[PDB]
Every structure is written in structure tokens, then in C-alpha cells.
Amino acid sequence: LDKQIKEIKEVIELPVKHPELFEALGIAQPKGVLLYGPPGTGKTLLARAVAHHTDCTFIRVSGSELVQKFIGEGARMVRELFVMAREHAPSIIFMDEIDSIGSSRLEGGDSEVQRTMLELLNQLDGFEATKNIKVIMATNRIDILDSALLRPGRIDRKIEFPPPNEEARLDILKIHSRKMNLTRGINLRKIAELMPGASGAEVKGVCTEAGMYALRERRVHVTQEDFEMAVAKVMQKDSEKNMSIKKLWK
Amino acid sequence: SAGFDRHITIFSPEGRLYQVEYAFKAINQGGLTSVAVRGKDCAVIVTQKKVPDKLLDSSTVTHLFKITENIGCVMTGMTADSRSQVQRARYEAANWKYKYGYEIPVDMLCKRIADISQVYTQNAEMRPLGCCMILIGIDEEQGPQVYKCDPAGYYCGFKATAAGVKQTESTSFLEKKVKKKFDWTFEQTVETAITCLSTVLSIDFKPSEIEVGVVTVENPKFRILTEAEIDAHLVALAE
Amino acid sequence: NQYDNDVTVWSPQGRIHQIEYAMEAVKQGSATVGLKSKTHAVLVALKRAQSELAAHQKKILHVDNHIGISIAGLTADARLLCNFMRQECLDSRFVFDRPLPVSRLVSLIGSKTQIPTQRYGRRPYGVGLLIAGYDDMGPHIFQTCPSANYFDCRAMSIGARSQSARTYLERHMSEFMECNLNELVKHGLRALRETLPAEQDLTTKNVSIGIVGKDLEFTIYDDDDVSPFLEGLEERPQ
Amino acid sequence: SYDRAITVFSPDGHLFQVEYAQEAVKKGSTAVGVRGRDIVVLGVEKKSVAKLQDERTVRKICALDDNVCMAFAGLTADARIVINRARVECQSHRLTVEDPVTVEYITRYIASLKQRYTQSNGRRPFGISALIVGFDFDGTPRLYQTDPSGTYHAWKANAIGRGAKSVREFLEKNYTDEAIETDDLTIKLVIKALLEVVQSGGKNIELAVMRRDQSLKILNPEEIEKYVAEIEKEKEENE
Amino acid sequence: GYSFSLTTFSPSGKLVQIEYALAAVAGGAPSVGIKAANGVVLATEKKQKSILYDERSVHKVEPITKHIGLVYSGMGPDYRVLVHRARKLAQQYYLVYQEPIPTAQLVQRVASVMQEYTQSGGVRPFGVSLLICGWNEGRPYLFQSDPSGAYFAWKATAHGKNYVNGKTFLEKRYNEDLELEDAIHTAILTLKESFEGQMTEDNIEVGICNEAGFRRLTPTEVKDYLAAIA
Amino acid sequence: GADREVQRILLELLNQMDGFDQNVNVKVIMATNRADTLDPALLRPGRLDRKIEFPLPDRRQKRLIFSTIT
Amino acid sequence: YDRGVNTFSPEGRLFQVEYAIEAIKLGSTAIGIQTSEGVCLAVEKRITSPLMEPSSIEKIVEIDAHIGCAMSGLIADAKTLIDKARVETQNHWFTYNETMTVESVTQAVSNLALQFGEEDSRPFGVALLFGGVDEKGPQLFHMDPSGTFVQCDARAIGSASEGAQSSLQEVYHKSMTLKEAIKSSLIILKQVMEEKLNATNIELATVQPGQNFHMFTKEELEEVIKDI
Amino acid sequence: TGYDLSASTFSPDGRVFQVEYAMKAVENSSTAIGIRCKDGVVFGVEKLVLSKLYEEGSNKRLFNVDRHVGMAVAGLLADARSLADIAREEASNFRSNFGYNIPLKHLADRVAMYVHAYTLYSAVRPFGCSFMLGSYSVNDGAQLYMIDPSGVSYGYWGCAIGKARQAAKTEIEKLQMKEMTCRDIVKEVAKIIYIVHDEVKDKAFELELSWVGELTNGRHEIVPKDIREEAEKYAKESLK
Amino acid sequence: RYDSRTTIFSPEGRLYQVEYAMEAIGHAGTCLGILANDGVLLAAERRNIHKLLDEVFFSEKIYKLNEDMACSVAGITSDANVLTNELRLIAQRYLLQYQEPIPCEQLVTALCDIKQAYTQFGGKRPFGVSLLYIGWDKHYGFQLYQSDPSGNYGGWKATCIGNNSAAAVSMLKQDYKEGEMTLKSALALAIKVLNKTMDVSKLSAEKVEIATLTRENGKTVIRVLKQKEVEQLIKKHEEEEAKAEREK
Ligand SMILES: Nc1ncnc2c1ncn2[C@@H]1O[C@H](COP(=O)(O)OP(=O)(O)O)[C@@H](O)[C@H]1O
């Protein structure tokens, strides 16, 4: 995520770590960033690491947590979450799968969904006490989201998280294998090449499955063959077949 | 669960036609069983005649019907749906008889009836008919046929079958009869059917409580057995 | 309610509440009275006023030299049914030069009104009708309802505030059979006045009358014509 | 009873789906037409020709008569549908009627077609509005506007689309009650608005002119830029 | 979801009801179709749920023409409808052109039919997927037609229960140079590999297209390949 | 709303399945009658350790169950 | 009970057509007066911008040389109803050569209006006044989406119908000259409806029995303007 | 509620619970009974009076099917009128086509199909009525058939419909209709109707009788009870 | 509900269902028509991926309407098949009337009007098919046209639809070539765009289906490319990327 990580360092870290420029520039600091990509592409990981380096506090609420079963509850949750963030010094607010409460609602109950997304937009728009307060949003497959939050005065930037490529697969396999007992004769590059279009999370999966193959055999070490049969379990996309593979949604 | 069963032309997430199985319930119609057996030169159907009240005329409450001098039909289902289905059977039999010059084969007639039931199954215009019909016939020098025809639009020929209140018991009893090697006479076939009905139902079976239709190669006329014949068979199996 | 959107849907009560709602729509219309004698059959309608400078709406229609109607319902449905009776009487006179018997006309009305009551997406005809006629078999007063039911009544009243008029007609039914035209028409006018509130009474504005007899073509008397019938009739004391 | 439909009314009584059609018109680009002393001129904006998108093909201006001309602002599919219908109607009227077409009749035709299409269940209204300019007003110019409600009105000068709020006021500011002498002056006036609406880029002014006796006339971008330069000289006077 | 109606798109542009039709497919009886070098073999399962059902009285492999064979994985009645339609369409092609209809043309016509059942608001598509084996101008053809109205070219494929097992099996154990007998052997092998329960003359039925003619193997031949072989 | 909410339920289950923090030894156990359904996100290798198939008892097994209970 | 006219309320009323009456209410106001001298109609244009041709909005029309009309409501299909009225007069007169009674013209328009649940759409959400003269009497008539229709002496429909109707009722009597009726109606329109009279938003059309020509008021308002 | 909303979908426990609602509507109506004597068929019906407003002998519920076919109904009255119309149409069709009078089995089965087919289609509803048809064929026998809202047609020696199905059947079961003839059958029918709630709670009603018998010529007529009112006297003697 | 039926707009006036149709298009196998002169081409790599798929037509993405007219597919399969057949009948109608080859824009209109007429009626589903046309006619000769589900049509010298459509059109705009950009350069640019848009390294010949129109003898010829030329073109682009590396 080096390109993505650099963009998010800029937009988040610079106002928090070096506000003076934005004072000298006079411009108000940017408020937040939306993160979009296929599920499992390190979005929460990136937000968590950014919060850790920036030394400010991490507060999380998934969009699905906002809904609730009663009217006037999402608004209360959002407002008191902003109160918590403000009370918690410099802080980044993280909201996973925000699309769950931001989507096509003009179809038409649904009332509280709007009364929640509008309330969140009101909290961020009024730049309420935004002295070192930032928000981070995460979405799977941006398209389902709506522009009401992306409108220029509102949240400012978007970052794309495409599925990891060969080099990214190399990193992620290395990082999640760093703790596992690996053996000479391993060829991890063949493994990364053999896993086209991974989402990153399933590479944590392939490491997990190679280790499970070691464990169920009571072996505390992993080899090339273990990972190679692991990847077979990690395919799981062979369950496509005739249905819609080349017809309809070809 | 709710939603894929409110209308007929809807596939479930697993692809299940809910309304087809749902119409399959009305086939129960507690009171009839329609056991049909094929023997070396005969085809026999017997249905259970559950009359709730005495004042009804016994002839009107019959459930066996004919569409050909050599074809017999029996019914298990909602009585009105029953009579509509057999009337469509008359319609098709008459049209085939006019068009081809000779009466419809039983396999083709089951095919036509199942075809119409499938037609109402595939299209939401009309409810599928909640009834199951069974046909007995003869085909030239080749054999007697027993055919079951269902609202799903499915149909098949059998050594024997029974769509009735004691479904699995009757079917397993007939399998047990056929999974042991034996011959098949007219009286032996009727005996197998009557023993099935009596054993699965466990009732003492006075004559008026059942109705028997039959066809036989030596006398290919479709006949409804008179009370005397059915009581003779009852005492034959009783002793 | 779950089972009250269309007449095609039965209720667990063994009822069709939409037909009853059509009955209530009929009850929304103003009261009308019908009564017959051995000499004449008369119907009278309470013409609802709209303002002091607008015509009081017509509620008695003429379709045949021996047949008349008084309506209580949505005016469109009643008047197009009136066109339907126009068609049938005209084609009957075409076919065999016969003034169409009232009973068979009313039966045809019921049969045609029955069709919407058993089909989806088509409103049953939300009007109640009183039909007056004289024919080769007798004098005739019928009532028809959106349930397609049709009845023969020696006296009848349909519409809002009708209960008092129906009771008055029940009392004077013992009279009407041998009553003369003048007696019958004045009793019908009083039957209508029974419906009204205390401050509302018979006047040329609110009253319309239609008469059929063994010696006169069914005629509707309105405005000036109503004046001689009301004059000489007893006023209302408190 | 909320809107949720085309043929139902909210308790207020207004058809909100017609409102949705007029907003669908509102999301379209600018379109401002006028009539002059003798001539009628038009210039469309927002070409936004993106490289391989050769601007000619989309045909922002269509002339469908021996002499009449307009496209439709909104969604262009219904625009081309009404284009085909206008072709058929104008040619058929010219063939069948003792005298050729007039602008009033064809505008009434478009309005009636839109109304008739709207007035039914399961039939989407044309969410398109248009400005029609024609010559045979007894040899005089006149301009009409058509609205998805199936409505037709007459204008001396009208604007619809993204500039409807702005350009109309512009017209209310400066449409001279003096009949426009030197109809090229009217062309300069309308080009001013047609440019100023879209950022006065000078690239999307795509323009047609008809002197109420002529056939279709078109203005190339350089010749339109001539009027643009004259308008710039007029605007530079404030010094 | 967007499944109670067929004539409306989902926000992701997915016709959901037809994928429910495809889910109805592969829930039915297993079937496998393979193109050999010379012939085309379609095998299907015909176990009777009880000894009551007469295995010699019903068939699932059907000759649409003397050079076309059809096999299916779905509920029977819809397959009967489409068999009737395909037979009439082939006969009408014969009447129009005075030529026996080639495999591809009949396949695209049946696909167009299955298409015309994919619209409107008061009907449903057929819940059946079809293998068409044919001979045309000396060339053998195998085609698959599916409820969406589309069709695919296969040298080998399978559907029904355990169909993914069939895809894997024909991926491993297949080459286009197969002789006819080895092709039928592969067909019964994949049928068993997808199958659960015993297999004999009464349990399986197969149909072979050869350029001279197509024919449905008798139960005895289905046993000869089925038993004492493999 | 029922459909959206059930989808949010399964997604929230997914986030909790991946979310529980290390050194906590909880085990999520899953029961199902069919398992030809079930979205391929529980079968993902990073969440599924073993898939154990519980058939209707056959001979031998039925004998064992009868003996044990009786 | 919201999908259409084919559903009845617990009180019987159809919850579709009352909305059509309220659709009358959203339209421009319209007035009509019946006098023994002549029958007159008035209408407000609501000219959105004077850059429009004020005559373009056909809120005042002539069905025929003896009969004129005004309407209030959605307007769009009101023109269709005027078309039906004109075809009715054309056909009936060309066939029978007897003049169409304005009562009969309104009856034919009503017969058209009864085509939303009575055969095999939606009610025409607009109301109309007709003013006509005939060999038996000069009359004015009123029409509403339900298809019912009534003879009236002084009628008002559209927006602000109630107040204009009250004033019109108070000024009316049975022996007025058409000049006094016109002046009273115009001053009422000025006080309650919009503003002082001008040629680009008000319209008047009047008809007399012996006059089959110029059933309109046009390019002569100046005398009123100085002498209203 | 479930899936019992129209008569084209099998509701849970496949019985539709719709045509059963039509039967519930049938139960609301007053009783009609029908007997077959040794050589004839008789029908006896009670009908409510609207009020003293009502004209005597109006909206009566006996109906003529054919010159020799008689009708008795219960349930929705107007649906019964429409059923009488279509039954007359069917009888006329057979009369015109075959050239001789229709056997009542065929006509009854065709009307049963009409009712049944009306039960299916989604745009329509099952009939809210059930009815008996009676006739005599001098060539071979007498005939009676009863039909429910579902379309089920059966024959009876004695049958009853209305608000007193089973009670009326208990009343009928102990008659000697096995050999008894119609002339006292009318008296027995009138007294049986008066036995089951003549005017106990419902104030007043009208009693109508229909007859088809060889002694009646085998045609359909309304029994002249004006003759000495013997059945009326017997039914009012039923007091105790 | 608004988006449940095709006849309902948004309160903003938009139509959701056609938008859903273009989102559906977003799935389709990547296919483009390239910018070229004195010739045209419409490359369409087949998204079908299984070694046991037989591709017996050698063409499932390009359909020849006439020897001077060809069209592609990007969307629903059965809808596309019936629509291409209908293209053939409409072209047959025009030819059988006039005995003259149809102009490109006229056929494009006729189809798009038919599609719009299907969409705007109720009880019917909009066609989820976007498609491209290459053709030569008397009025304008070489032409490439775009069409969407709503019945819209446009003229494009080079365009692409399917997966990564935005990326393909954007890079076509980045390395835009004009004028001397004849047919062979268009084949090279199509190779470049197919290599960039697809994830496959060393793009395989069977994955791609290519067609081109060239005016032979004034009678015109439309070729669907075989294996050999495809292999040559892709290998040449690989070694061209190697050459681009040689500059380093
Ligand atoms: N580039 C990466 N390096 C290391 N781990 C990763 C990477 N991408 C994803 N992961 C693992 O996969 C998970 C991705 O979660 P996330 O992408 O936030 O899911 P969602 O898309 O549902 O928000 C992380 O918890 C992390 O452990």
C-alpha cells in the first residue's frame, strides 16, 4: 500500500503533525478521507497504523453498528461518538462499511437511515471543534455509496485499494510468514504468482492454512508443499462454473 | 421462507418451486388411496370410498372414470379439481380419437395431462390443479400399463403405485410384495391390492367402503367391479 | 385491512367488505322514496341543494314512456346505468314494439351489476336505484343495490336519513294499495319530509317527483309543477 | 396516498411524476431559443467534445420539416423518438393536407403525443422539453416551447435546461421590446447568453438560423465567433 | 431480494431470478456430456426412487432428430416442453429448407426459446440446463443451453449434483483424441464419480451421436459399459 | 429492511470472527443442515479450521447408538 | 385504499377523485356569470413572464360561435376536453343542423370524463365553465372531474374559489344588466384575486343570443381601464 | 392471514381457505332443502322479509332453470341469480344442439365446472353460493344434484343448504323418502323447515316450494299451496 | 417503489434501471474499437476462461451484420444474441427495400429507437447491452459508434467498454494518435490497451478475439482474426515493451 500509504500520510498526518503550515497557509485543515476497495484490502490496518504513528487516538464504529432498532438512536450515537472523540484529545474516527448507512435511499421505513447519515454529515460539516479531530471512512465497492458525504465542503479525499499485485503479495506473504517457522527450499515467489487476484486478507489466509496443515500433522514447521496445498483451499473461486461465468453477467 | 411461495412462477434461492410441493399436499385428501397393480395380463386400481353421510347417493360419490373403451382412470384429490381434470381427459381423448382415427394411448394421455398441469405450473395465469390421476390401459400384444400423473407435470409407469393417505406404508408394502418372486394372476393382482389397502388401513373393509376398477387383456373393456365381485374378493382374502 | 381491497377477495367472516363499502357509498346519497298503488307507481327524490344560485341537482330520470328511476349514489355510475336502460328499452321496442316489462329490466340491471362484483380491479356500481313502472302484469317498484341484488317493494326508501321515511312507509303501506294518485303522491311527499331535519321541509328546491300510471306516461314534475302538489298539503307544526 | 405512480394523485392533487419529468428536463444542458424581427436563431452549448467523440454525430440540432428545426433537451433517447415521430408527422401532413405544415399544428402534435403517452399506466412520459421555431406563421417568425406535461406555449424568447433560471432572467433583463433591427444583432445577443451560460468558451455555440423564408441555415464556429467578437466589442465599451 | 419479479434489474445489474433458476439447475439429477474425436456421448442418471418405478418405461435421453440428442439436468416437465418445442422447430426447419437442421442452428433456436421465456412479469424461465449432441457436415458438436437463454461450446462438461467434481474429472481424465469406446467409458466414469448409490442397466442411460446416426443406448448396453467394465 | 439487516448481521459476524484479539482462546462453532448454501466467506481459510460432516447414522453407527442408549 | 377509484372507503367515498377536486383547487381562478342580457366568463392567466405571448395560454377559449369556455386545474387535458366539445358541436350540427344545447355539450364532455374506471386511466383533474346561448335560453354551466355538472347563475372555480364565490354570490341578483355584472366581477377579481386589471393577465369572453361573432373581449379594454 | 388472500395460490395446509370463505358465506344464508320422492323432486326454501316496506313475494329464491329443471339456492343471492342465468344458458345450449332435453347429470356437471373454473383464476373469485338442481326424466327416472362453491357435485335422497345444514339433515334422515310420494312430501318439507327456527329469533319469513314430478308432468312448477294450505297448517301445527 | 419498475423516475428525474444496466455493463469482457484510418477494427478479448470451452465459432464477441458492417457485445448474453439477430433483420429490411447498403447512423438509430421503445413501456425490462459498431457507408465511410441500454448512441473514433472501461478510454486519450494513425498502428494500440487492461502476463491468443474492416475492391471485407496474426501481434508488443526497457 506504499502509494496509498503515502497519500494518507499526507492528508491525515500533515495537519495533525504540522498544523503550522495550514496556519501560515491560513487554509482550514482537511477533515477526513474515504477508503474504498474490495473487502480485506488492509483499509482498517492502514487507518490503525496511521492513528498509531500520528500518536492521536483511534475510535471505531462500523456503519452496521449505527443502525439500531429505534428512531433517534443513530443520531444520539453519532453525536456522542463525536463528543467522545473531542473529549479524547487529537483523535481519528474510523467507520468501517459506512456504505451500510450510506447508499441509495430514494427508493423508499428507511427514515432513520437518512436521519443518521444526515446527522453524521452535520457533525462533520460544521467542523465541530475540529482542533486535531479527523474522521476516516471505509467502503467496500465505492459505487453503492452516495455523493452526499463526498460533496466538496464535506469529507475531502478518496483512496483506492485495488487487490494486491505480485510485489504486494510478496510483502504480505513475507509479513505474515515472519512469525511462522519456514524451511529452506521454500520458493514464496512461485506461491505469490500462483495466487492471482488475492485480496490481501486471503494471503493471511494462505499463511494460516499452511500453518494449519503443519499443525494437524503436529509439525511445528512449514514447507513449500504445505503452502501449495493451502493455496488450493484458498482458491474458493472455482465455485463459479457455468452459472453467470460467461453468460448474463459474463 | 416467505416470499418465494406467495406466487407460483418464482424460484427459491435453492431453486424450489414452493407451490408445486404446496399443491402436492392437497393430493392427500384423507379418504382415498388409489392403489394400482399390474399383473401378467391385467391392470387393477382400487380406491377407498370414505362416505361421511348416509343420505348421499352412492353412485354420485364415485371417483373412477373412463376415457376409452380400453382405458380406465382413477382420481385422488379435491373432488372439483378431480372432475375438471377428468373432463380435460375426455376433451383430449375425443380430440385424439377424431384427429388420428383411433383412441389415444395411455402413455400419451398421461403425457397430455401432465403437460397441461406443467403448463399451469410454468405460467402464473391459472392455479395448478390439486389432484393426482392414475391410468390403466392395454397396448398391442405388448402389455398392460399403469401410469401415475401428477400436478407437478410429472408422470411415470410402474409395476404398482399408490398415492394415498398411507403413502409410504402402501408404497413399501407394494415394494415388499414385488421384491419377492411370485407370479401375477388377475385374482392374485386384486388380492395384492386389497391386502395392501386392508393392511395399511387396518379397517374391516365392508364392501361399500371401496371401489375397484380393472382392465384385462382377455376382456380389455374398462370395468368398475360390482359389489358382488369385490365382496367375493374380500372373502377370498379373508379366508 | 388485509382482506378489504377488492371484491375478488373474500373475508373470513364469509363476507365481501368492499361490497358493504359500496353500500355505504350508496348511503352517502340523499334520501329517495318509492311507493305504488293499484293505480299508480310514484317515486320522489330529495334534490340536494348546492347554493342559492345553482340548480338543485336532478335525482329522477326518465328513460321510457312507462319507466322511471330515482337514484342515490355516484352520479356517473347511475347515469351510465340510465344510458344502459335507454339502450335496452330502445332495442326492445325495435325488436317487438313492446314497452319493456319493468321486472325483466330490473333483473337485467342486477345481472349486469353482478359482473364487477366478482372480478378484480373493477368497482361494483356504487349507486342505489328505485325503479317505477306499469306493465301488462301490474304496477312495479323495484330497488337495486351494488351487490347486484334486486328487490320488489310496495314502499321503499334508500339514502341518508332514510330510517324515518322507511318507518313512515311501513305505517302507510296499509294504505297505499287502494290509494288514488293524489293520496299516494302526497303520502310520498310526507315520507320524504320525514327524512329531513326539523328546519328543512318540502319545497320546490329540494323535491322532485316522478309518476307512472295505468292512464299516464311516466312524467317528472319539477319546479312550477311541484307547486300545486305542495300547496294544499299540510304544513309542519312543531 | 403518496405519489409512487403516474396515474394517481396525492391529496393535494398534483401528479408528482410529471414533476419528476420536469426535473429530468432540468438536469439537461442549456437551450435558449428566440424569434427576431424576421428571423429565428438558436445556439446550443455544452458540446464538451472529448477527443475521439466527434461532435457531429450526436446531432445537437435536428431539422425535421421542409423547414423547422430543434432537438430536445433532457434524455436524448426520447428526443430521437420524438424526432422520428416528428419526421413521420410532418411528411404525412404535407402529403395528406391540402396545404403544407405550420408550426402551430406540429407543436400541438408534439404536445398531444406527450400527453397521450403520459396518460396511461405503465408508460413512461417523455422527460424532454423543446423550443420550436417555424416560418409559416403566415410568413412570420414565432417560437414555441413544449413541456413533458404535454404542454405548449408561445414565447418571444425562452430558455430551458440548466440555464432556465439564469438565461430567462437575462432575457427579462435585455429582450428589447424594439423589434430587433439587423437580426444579426439578435444573433449576437443570443450568442452572448449561449456562451456566458457555458463559461463563454466559444467552442460550444453550435448554431442555426432561419429567416422565416429560408431553408435551414447553420453557423460554423468561426462565423459564430465573428458575432462573439462583436459582442465582446459591445461589452468592452465600459471604459 | 430482486427475485419475486423477473422483469426488473438489481442495483448491481443482476437478474436475480434467473440465477435462482440456475440454482434449481445442478440440484437435479447428475448428467455429463463429452465430445470424443468421432462421437458425442451424453450420460445421465436414472435411478428409481423405489422398485415401483419402471426403469424401462421412461427415458431422459431424447432424439430430437435422427442426428440430434438432448439430455438435461432439471425438473422433467419443463424439459418435456422444450423437447416438444425443439422437435417442432427442427421439423419446421426441415420443411423450410428441405435440409436436416445442423447442430448449431437447432441449439441457437432452442436458446432463443429459453430466451423468450426470460421476460415479462407473469412467467418464469425453465429451471433446466441442456446438453445437445449433434452431427453436422461430418463434424461432431456438443452444446450447452441454460435458462438464461445463452449457450456454450464444450468438448466436455457436466452439471447436476456433484457437478464441480465432474468439471475436475473431465479436466484431468480427458483428451480430444478419445476413441468412441473410451469416450463412453469416461462418461460412465464421471457419472459414477458424481453419483451416489449403485449403477447398473436400470440406473443409467446414455446417448451417443455418431456422424452416421445418433442413438440412445439400450439399458443392456448401458450395463455392458456400466458393469463388467470399469 | 429485513434483508438489509440480515446482511448486516452476517457481515457483523464476519467482522467479529476476524476481530477477536490475540491471546483470547475463543472458538466459534458452526452448525448447519445443508451447507451447500453458506457464503464462501466462512469457508475462507483465515476463518475456517475444519469442516466436519455429521451424517444420518448408518449400519454400525445405528448399532452403536442403539447399544449406547439402551 | 390508495391505488385508484376501484377501491371504496369505509364511508364509501373513493380516495382518488377528491384529489382531483383539490387538483381543481391548484389551478388559476375562473369566474362565470349568467344574465338575461348575455353570458360572461373571466379567467386569470398567471402569466409566468410577460416575455410569453399572453394569448398563448388558452385558459379562455371559444368552442363555437354560440358557446365559450373557461377552466381551472391541470389545464393540460382541459384542452383535450375543449377539443371533445368542439368535435361534439361540429358533428351534431353538421348531422342534425339543430344547435347543440349547452346542456348537451356539457353532457357530452361528461360522457368523455367517465372513462377512467367505467370501461374495460385517471380522472381529468380540471373543472370547466361553459357559457352559451341557444334558441330557448342563455345559460351557464359547470363541470368537474367526477363527471357531474350543474347549472349555475354565478360560479367560481380554481384557487381562491371560496372568497371569490362569496363576493360573487353577494353581488348577484336575477335582473342585472351585463354591464353591471361585468364591472362587479372585474372589481371583485381586482380586490381578492391578484391586482389591478391589465391586458396581459386577465381574460373576458361574453356571448349574446343574436351574436355569432366576436364572443371575445380584445383590444378594447382601455375604456374600462380609465373608467373602472 | 398467511397465503390465504386469493383462490389461485395454495395457502398453507394446501386447502385454499378462500373457497372455504365462500362456504362461510354460504352458511350465513337461510336454509333450503330438497327431497326426492318415489316419482318426484321437491324443494322447500325460507327467505327473509326486508320489512313491512317489502312487497310480498319479492326477490324470491326459487328459480327456473329449464322447462323441466328446477333450482334452489343458498348463499349470496345475486351470485345465485347469475348462476341461474348461466344454467339457463347451458340448458338452452344443450336443447338447441342435441335436439332433446338435457340429462340433469350433464347440466349439473357443466355448472359445477363453471363454478370450479371460476374458483381458479386470479382475477376472479369462487361463487359465494351452493345450490340444488332437480328434474324428472319420464323415460328412466328422477334426478337431483347438489353443488358447493368449490364445484363438487353429488346426488342425494335428501339434502339441505343454509344456516342449518346438519340439523336439517337430522330432520330429513327419519322421513320415509325411500318409498314416500311427493303429495305429503310437501307437507313434511314445510313442517321440517318450520321445525328448525321458523320465527324464534328472526321475526318473519316467506316459505316457497318447487316441484318436479311425473304427477306434476315432470316439468318445473311452483307448488300451489294456495289450495287449502294443508302444508301451511301442518307447519304451524308443528308448534309442539 | 421507484426502482422496482422501469416507468418511474427519481424525484431528481433520473432513471435508476438504466443506470443499473450500465453497472451491469461494467462486468462485461473488455472490448474496444480502436482509432484508425483507411480501415477500422473492433478488438474484443473473450472473457470466457476454461480450457474445455471449445470456441467452435472462433467468434462469440464480434458479429458481422454485412461485409461492410460489424458490431460487438458488452452485456447480457441472450439479450445481445436477440439484439444482434434483430440488427440482421433490420439491415435485411433496409436492403430488401432499397437494394442499397444501409448507412451506419441510420441502422444505429433504428436499433437504438427500438431499444428505447422497449425500455419506456411498462412490464418490460431494459436491455442490459452496450455495444459498438464499425461500418462503411456512402455518406461517411469508416465509422465507429457507441450505444447504451437507454437507446443512446454516439460517434467515437476510439472507445472501449467492459471491465476497466474508464482505464482503457483514459489511456487511449493519454496516447491518442491521429491522422497518420492507420490500421496497423490501431492493431498495435489495441494490443497495448488489452495488455494494460487485463491482468494476464504474456496475453494469450485464445483469450482475445479481433476483427477488422478494410475496403477491398470497394466491396469491403471484414476479417475475424485467426491464431497466427494474433500471436504475431501480441509477441511483437511484448518485444516492443522490451525495446522500451532498452532505453534504460
Ligand atoms: N497489505 C497488507 N499487509 C498485511 N496485512 C494485510 C494487508 N492487507 C490486508 N491485510 C490483513 O487483512 C485484513 C484486512 O482488513 P480490511 O481490509 O480492513 O477489511 P475490510 O475490507 O472488510 O475493511 C487486515 O486485518 C490485515 O490483517
Author numbering:
A (entry chain C): 154 to 261, 265 to 406
B (entry chain G): 6 to 244
C (entry chain L): 4 to 241
D (entry chain J): 2 to 240
E (entry chain H): 5 to 234
F (entry chain D): 280 to 349
G (entry chain K): 8 to 127, 134 to 241
H (entry chain M): 5 to 244
Mind quoting what the paper says about this structure?
The 26S proteasome unfolds and degrades hundreds of proteins to maintain proteostasis, regulate cellular processes and generate peptides with second messenger functions. It consists of a 20S core particle (CP) capped by one or two 19S regulatory particles (RPs) that gate access to the CP proteolytic chamber. The redox-active thioredoxin (TRX)-like protein TXNL1 is expressed in many cell types and was proposed as a nearly stoichiometric component of the human 26S proteasome.
On the basis of the locally refined map, we could reliably determine that only two subunits, Rpt4 and Rpt5, are ATP bound while the other four Rpt subunits are bound to ADP. ADPs, thus, accumulate in up to four subunits, which may subsequently allow several subunits to move from the bottom to the top of the staircase in rapid succession. ATP hydrolysis and phosphate release appear to not immediately trigger the seam subunit’s disengagement but instead accumulate strain in the hexamer, especially for the PSRpt5-to-PSRpt4 transition that involves two hydrolysis events.
